[PDB]
């Protein structure tokens, strides 16, 4: 195997409710928990007639976790597993990590130690957080922190929603994201990344809708994610374990962050049009306008991709569609890497929301990868930071929250060697 | 006699299902049923692969080794999946990480003793043991690492009985994994020094041979596997049938390995014609040698035409003239004197069973020991260095208790192995 | 690797150890701690230990040292006492790190501490 | 086997009414006495329809025993067995032991000699008192006193409710508890202890309710106690006699005081949640937040535990769940006790009040034990005493009641060697 | 032939119910019913365990000794509980305190005479007496103390008839009591000097052997007991059946005890396969010796592989070849020459009944006298000292009229007993 999941921060919780929705939806388990091993690596058979959740929920304002215990699904989780700190969220790392966030952690852990025990030989914890938040950046920082020590012997794949390249929200965002990166870096196994803005494009350009509610982006990651755990931990013609990832996906200890991408994003109402070919979707994967991340392969050489397919797919179709790609060159893969294509084949096709806006094809490609591209994304996000730090901007908000000129300046230097790292492991031969 | 199959890893396992899917029908053994055998000859020699308990339950005597439950739990939850005695399933619910090191030193090393245990329960079954069949892929954990260990132990326990190895060497064009050359180079190393007969198959040499030699447009894995399993049946099981001139693992071994490395072969089936149409029946015999000896049709990736042969073993199995067989082989040896090495007056080892593949009239398995396979270990060995140089995904190995000298070792070894093989191409 | 660790351990402790599994007994782990702390009741530790019951005592001693010192690191005796390779490999690796940071300048006489056992 | 019981002091009587309730409740004997040997070791089959109790009730104010003869159960006991001294209670040892309490004792005894005769080869008297009271501390002091001489040849297990660590009631409490300890010490066999405050925690943390009426704590001990006598004196797969206890439970003549603990404390309303595993409850037993005693194993090494299980339990499950524990070393190490785990297995699962707040599982663990821990609890309670004695505080209240500077100072020295005793028998090898 | 069982204590008693539960069916005796025996052979020798009164009521000739009513009142209020003549129930309504001293010197010493009384009524039954079977646990009052007395008296009354003792020596990992080593060391003492055949069983050696050799997930006590009772049936009762080569308590005794201590054995059953599946029938014979002689499968705690054997008695009971029996035993004696002691050319005592366990085809009880059991009395003896040193729960003994020299005595004695046993391991 299983893989627990800790959805931290309002966002990580909204996305959580979403990814958690898509789940039962493709497993025939109504919001009442009941369906009429396989998928046991994400659901515990509490007896009994029910299913329950194999995860937890951590937010410092009740508002968001509250809504879960109102709307059907209310029945799905255990009243217990949804942790809250009535106190204050605070869009600031410090407070969430140190000062406040601290008080809850114990309790938090307890569940990921109480839920981690009940199972049978697990594989890790799929963590869901929103980089630039208070409860999402800070808190987790120490949650993943306390995990890397309590279970160093497992997988720590954290699924993040890192800062929109130009459309950020919080005024401080970078402070909170240069801080969640440096503290988690030395603790994660593989950090998946899905860019909030670069997903909108997909909603504008590849689905058409200027009315994208957060509830949609969530349905999307809620999809790409389903391709990761759900179906993969599910039997198939070319299974891929969680460990598999980090192994076939990270060339170096830095909790390396690949990018999530999905192939068939086409709007219902298009739903009837003749379906796309195994070749087209494959090709769509090499287009910088369909990757849930504003890290357009502006130069970033891929260094490993895990093409997770699902649905009706002939291994030759793949071991050909990929061959064609391996020789497009304009898709330049790293040097020190001969072949970096982990072909993951599942059976059961995707499963689109009954009536959202997702096409509903009979095959998809959730390809994720490490690309020297993020050399950018990190850069552009680091620079941000400086500008403000350069004037201390909202610094007094953290200091007064148990932090110091140290943690900032010393977490800046941190990422600095992440701009050099993602530079050295590539661009050079 | 006898032999005891070994399904190492998922692949080696997935294939188990196909090797046994076949073989059984080539021995009239229904799921749990007994011998429905259309004939009476598909029984006098079964022992080679089964055991007598009930009287209708001849259970395959193989081993299912894997650190990923889901797999064996797909093979055990499907068709023939319910024939293996549960005792056979040596699982490792651990994290079957894709690391050679994770299934050879850290994770697999534990599950080993609980395997050897059974490999002995099966060996000490009865009568006289011949050797063990080993299926797996050299591009993963449970395959290259843990399976490559299973043998290093087997070959210490019975350096007498033989060891055929069916390896799915990392296909060129596209690698179905990333560290591939890591998991590979490391397993070939173990092979060149334990098993004494290896049959290397390439998922893409198959596609080709399966999409152009079988107009088959959607070659699912099941197929590839199926084709492979077709060859390993012609090899073993087959020869454990009567014949004007029959051989058996050893003959095959003692006629095919000039030098102790162990050397790897490249299997090729005979009638490989598309269903309906093609059913040309041009199978008098010159048609089978026509087949078998062409470039395409060699389950290997490399092309024979790219390097002499040391030995060849046309293991035919269908009533034919020891004259039109013994003869053909000759012209073949003269039309291509160029590539067939000379210091062996008669490279070819003609073998001849009687009963053919259940539904066919005449077939002939080909087991070639050509120097061409040099151009594959080269490949592999290259991929290594190009990535070793930068220690690419090495932390996943070392961090699992490995050595920086371990990788060095293997490459070199297997790298030298390339060298030697050329010593005969010249 | 196992080879490297074993070489290190044998030199430090002046032990014979052929394989990592041998560490399962728990003696060596206690002595490693002794080199650092020098607080361990060495006479009590069953260095030679043949039987499992003896191993348990070593583990208890090890556990006590951790508690006394306030060492946070987890010790899953159930896993280690089995003498399984992976569990012991992991524990030994951590111990070496612990030793590297903690071990003081003072010289340590492993043989004498053992009573030449 | 039988075992008489003497509930002394209002409290010991409230708790009594409670423990006495749980009883019939799980024996099908309505408050009318009638049910439609086994359990005869606690109930005498008087007349040819009824089940007159097998105990007595001693309070110097009528108020509390009065309420028993109002509320159904009124029918349960014999009008006789509920002793009272219309006179005065007095929250002071002296008066209750010497002066007043004396007058009643004879009469009291008479019943425990009249009820002790009627039976068939008994085993002892389960005494119920509240350490820090007037009728509970003093009186009993001489009741148990007069027993140790009249039946030295039996078991004297006194079930006490010793002084809340910070939430005491009486102003003098310690005076009354350093005095009931020294006088009873040389007379009891095994003294069970249940801390009033440390039980509240359980009601706050393991059941959730800031509305715990005394009537609840009573339901609780009323439970842990049911696991002692009731069910144990009741057939099973691993019976454990009363003697058994003191033998397997006291290493030394000091009327040693083990602690009571229960495993499944979970609130109704939780009542549906998937039940807990044999391993979890077992483990819950080694948590210092579930033991009816503010003696958190702050260092106190256990020296003998009597794990009384009840319900559906496989001996291997135990002879494994315990094995796992024996190798946790939570306790820390004294040399001297190899194995100190008396596994008591009963059949009939627990029996929760129809609608109180107790979960109602199908298996529980009432583990009691002697822990070098009380080295604390006694300490902290002794110190109290001094502070006041150091100024004589409410001394004139006892002196004027037939006591002297002797009994105090000489009962202080007493416990002193109880602080050394509980220290020597442990902490050393 | 004859013998007279003895159910000392609760355990020894609880087991009585299982030993008789079995044995009866292995003799067609329904609750109070008679001989429904599927055959006619399960009757010509019954006498060994029953008595003729009515003509349909063959009553078990055992004794039920216990100071705790509830117990015998659970065994007498359940299934076969109503077959024992009430005269058999020698209860002691006293306080069956868990003290060896309370059931051997103070409380039990009284109830003794009222027992011996019956043990004589049963002995003087008829024909010729062979010996008495004794069940109990060395970790309690009515078991170790009072039962250990029952024998010290029996062995003074008929130092001729034998005395098999079935003791449930205190399991290691976790003890089902606290003073355990006290009640134990004290009873083993009495054993090493009265009974002349002891079969030590370990509640946890059983679990293991019952949770891994019988995929049984919920091994209730009833089970353990049941398994044990299975062995004690193979021993006695069995040999009181025909056979190509039959033996009887004495043979067993006169072939298994080289030196008068009395020595303790470790019983092992043959077909011990999980229900459905496993029903492999691999019971030709090499399969039974395979079983019996492995480490696991020895009801004892210790592992044979940890110390030579002095004697062994494969008491088989199912039609087999005195050749494939006599033979196997040999290889076994040579593959493991290492541990099997040498000064005994033929350690093994092959025994062979005919009729097998009612529903089975072939079984074989194993009674091993290995030096390995040294590593158990060691255990026990250790636990003692570690706690004796501090006189732990000693007041419960002395206060019952005991001696500080009594405990000394036993430990030493039983402690020396460890010593001696090593004198042969070398
Ligand atoms: N895809 C996606 N992004 C979201 C969602 N909710 C918020 N975000 C993004 O995540 C960031 C917002 O984090 P916040 O909601 O401010 O904070 P938090 O991380 O929940 O924790 P706190 O600051 O303490 O409240 C912004 O960059 C948002 O664009 C959501 O439901 N889906
Ligand atoms: N658990 C529990 N504790 C109680 C109960 N009633 C009282 N106590 C505790 O016992 C002590 C009170 O003793 P009192 O009621 O003052 O006195 P008494 O022991 O009945 O005797 P007198 O002083 O003569 O009235 C305090 O520590 C209370 O917290 C009860 O029903 N349950
Ligand atoms: N012919 C054939 N090749 C297979 C099959 N399954 C996998 N492979 C090939 O084998 C290699 C990886 O095999 P795989 O089955 O993943 O090994 P594994 O050890 O079980 O993998 P893991 O558990 O460590 S991730 C790839 O080169 C792939 O192309 C199969 O069923 N047939
Ligand atoms: N195999 C087996 N062991 C048992 C059984 N009953 C008890 N034991 C084991 O026997 C020992 C205690 O036996 P027990 O039956 O309590 O003796 P007793 O003399 O009757 O006990 P007491 O009356 O003095 S408390 C423990 O080690 C326990 O594990 C049983 O029915 N089968």
Residue numbers in the entry:
A (entry chain B), D (entry chain F): 2 to 37, 47 to 439
B (entry chain C), E (entry chain G): 2 to 44, 47 to 360, 369 to 437
C (entry chain I): 4 to 120
Sentences from the paper on this structure:
Biochemical in vitro reconstitutions (Bieling et al., 2008, 2007; Dixit et al., 2009; Komarova et al., 2009; Montenegro Gouveia et al., 2010; Zanic et al., 2009; Zimniak et al., 2009) have established that members of one class of evolutionarily conserved +TIPs, the end-binding proteins (EBs), bind autonomously, with their N-terminal calponin homology (CH) domain, to an extended region at the growing microtubule end. EBs recruit other +TIPs via their C-terminal EB homology domain, making them hubs for a protein interaction network at growing microtubule ends.
We used cryo-EM to determine how the CH domain of Mal3, the fission yeast EB, binds to GTPγS microtubules, which were previously shown to be static mimics of growing microtubule ends (Maurer et al., 2011). The Mal3 CH domain contacts four different tubulin dimers, providing an explanation for how the CH domain distinguishes between B lattice contacts and the microtubule seam: the binding site is formed by two adjacent α-tubulin contacts (toward the microtubule plus end) and two adjacent β-tubulin contacts (toward the minus end). This configuration is not present at the seam where lateral α-β contacts exist. In particular, our model reveals that as well as additional contacts with two α-tubulins (α1 and α2), Mal3143 also contacts β3-tubulin at lower radius on the H3 helix, which, strikingly, is directly connected to the exchangeable nucleotide site (E site). However, strikingly, we also observed an enhanced layer of lateral contacts at higher radius in GTPγS microtubules. The structural change in the β-tubulin H3 helix could be triggered by nucleotide hydrolysis, sensed by H3 via loop T3, which might be mimicked by the presence of a bulky group such as the γ-S-phosphate (or BeF3−; Maurer et al., 2011) occupying the γ-phosphate-binding pocket. We propose that a structural rearrangement of the β-tubulin H3 helix results in two topological changes within the microtubule: first, more pronounced lateral contacts between neighboring tubulins, and second, a concomitant establishment of a high-affinity binding site for the CH domain of EBs.
